[PDB]
Every structure is written in C-alpha cells, then in structure tokens.
Amino acid sequence: MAIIKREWLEAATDAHKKLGWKAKGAVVSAHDPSDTGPDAKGYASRHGSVVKRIAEGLLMDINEGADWATSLAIEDGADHYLWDGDGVGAGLRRQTTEAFSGKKITATMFKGSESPFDEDAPYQAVRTIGDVFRNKRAQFYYALADRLYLTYRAVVHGEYADPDDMLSFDKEAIGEKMLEKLFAELTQIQRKFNNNGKLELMTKVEMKQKLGIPSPNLADALMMCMHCPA
Numbered sequence: 001m002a003i004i005k006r007e008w009l010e011a012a013t014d015a016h017k018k019l020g021w022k023a024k025g026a027v028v029s030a031h032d033p034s035d036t037g038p039d040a041k042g043y044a045s046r047h048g049s050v051v052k053r054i055a056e057g058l059l060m061d062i063n064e065g066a067d068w069a070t071s072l073a074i075e076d077g078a079d080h081y082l083w084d085g086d087g088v089g090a091g092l093r094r095q096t097t098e099a100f101s102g103k104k105i106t107a108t109m110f111k112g113s114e115s116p117f118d119e120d121a122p123y124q125a126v127r128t129i130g131d132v133f134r135n136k137r138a139q140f141y142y143a144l145a146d147r148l149y150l151t152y153r154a155v156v157h158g159e160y161a162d163p164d165d166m167l168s169f170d171k172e173a174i175g176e177k178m179l180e181k182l183f184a185e186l187t188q189i190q191r192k193f194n195n196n197g198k199l200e201l202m203t204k205v206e207m208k209q210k211l212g213i214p215s216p217n218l219a220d221a222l223m224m225c226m227h228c229p230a
Contacts, residue, residue, distance in 0.1 A: 002189065009169075021163040026048070029080070031066070033088055074100075079205060116135060141189060154166060178218075185218050
C-alpha cells in the first residue's frame with residue numbers, strides 16, 4: 001500500500017548533480033505544526049525542483065513552532081509558504097502574516113481534507129482530477145510520488161524527463177541525518193481503501209493508531225511544498 005519506493009529516494013538524492021541541471025523557479029516552503037508534546041514539527045523548502053532544507057522543530061509549542069518555521073522561510077528566501085491548517089494549525093494565519101510583514105512572501109493555509117486543487121480539470125499522465133484523487137492530501141502526495149518516479153526513471157533507466165517534473169534532494173544542503181529521517185517517513189505513507197474508487201491516503205492519526213507509526217511531519221511538510229499557490 002506504500003506509495004513511495006526507497007529506491008526512488010536514493011536515485012533522487014543529488015539527481016540534479018547526476019543529470020546536470022540546476023534549481024530554477026520559485027522557492028516554496030512548508031510547515032507541519034504539532035500541538036505541544038511528543039511529536040516533532042516539520043519544515044521543508046525547495047527551489048524549483050531541488051529540495052534544499054528539511055528541518056525538525058523540537059520542544060516547541062504551536063506558536064514557537066510557527067515562529068521557527070516562518071523564520072526558516074525568511075532565511076530560505078521563500079516566495080511562498082504553506083502550513084497545515086486541518087488541525088492545531090487552523091489558528092496560525094495571524095501570526096504567520098505578522099511574521100512576513102513587509103516581505104514578499106505569500107502565506108497559504110493547506111487543508112489536506114479539501115477536494116483537490118483544480119478538480120474539474122482533466123487528469124494528466126472524461127476523467128478529471130477530482131475523479132482520481134479524494135482530496136488534496138492524496139493529490140499532492142501523488143504529485144510528490146510522480147516527481148520521484150520520473151526522477152528514478154531518468155537517473156537509473158536513462159529516460160529523459162523535464163527537470164521541472166522531477167525532484168532532487170540536495171544532500172549537502174539538507175544534511176545526511178535529516179535526509180534519512182525524511183526518507184524513513186516517506187516510505188511509510190500509504191494508500192487506504194476507498195469506496196468510490198478514488199486514491200486516498202491514511203491520515204497521520206490513522207497511521208499512528210493502526211500501525212504505531214510516529215507522526216510523519218517531515219514527509220507531510222515536503223508534500224505540502226508540492227503545491228505552488230497561484
């Protein structure tokens with residue numbers, strides 16, 4: 001039921017160096033908050049198709065976490081910042097906009113439970129995006145999985161892909177330890193059965209309660225940065 005293969009992640013590590021392209025596009029950053037207790041918070045940032053930061057936020061309350069993550073976004077030169085507003089982060093818009101006062105950084109609340117972005121458009125690569133994906137959580141995790149698979153095929157099988165459709169992890173920038181923590185979370189993201197034939201993923205709560213998997217906040221942060229708001 002897992003949606004991302006470890007081999008794709010290994011291939012995608014420094015794929016831009018392996019294939020000879022560099023980061024181009026906006027800088028997109030995202031934060032997965034957590035209450036105040038056991039589970040580390042998450043942050044991810046990319047410059048175009050190259051991931052440059054994966055960070056864990058430890059021993060922080062919800063507001064300290066948002067300060068931490070928005071400060072990283074500023075440090076990373078983000079053009080866009082997203083955060084999870086489905087849970088305890090639902091109240092963070094004021095603090096987030098305050099943090100970005102006077103800076104050209106957009107702030108977007110991501111709610112994975114919502115119907116997919118652009119759900120009436122045809123599905124690519126009569127069937128629409130909304131027929132395929134239950135919600136944004138599924139849509140953007142599959143955006144991630146699709147980028148990774150294409151990168152694997154390019155790096156390992158020599159099949160051309162546009163760098164804009166791939167994803168590379170900058171290992172030197174991110175750091176080996178944090179990259180490994182991310183990969184260990186990503187390989188646990190899984191599909192669940194859906195009675196309307198749509199792609200749907202387990203939520204963080206379900207993963208913990210059913211499989212004893214700690215909240216994958218690094219993975220979810222990276223997933224959210226797949227959406228570049230319009």
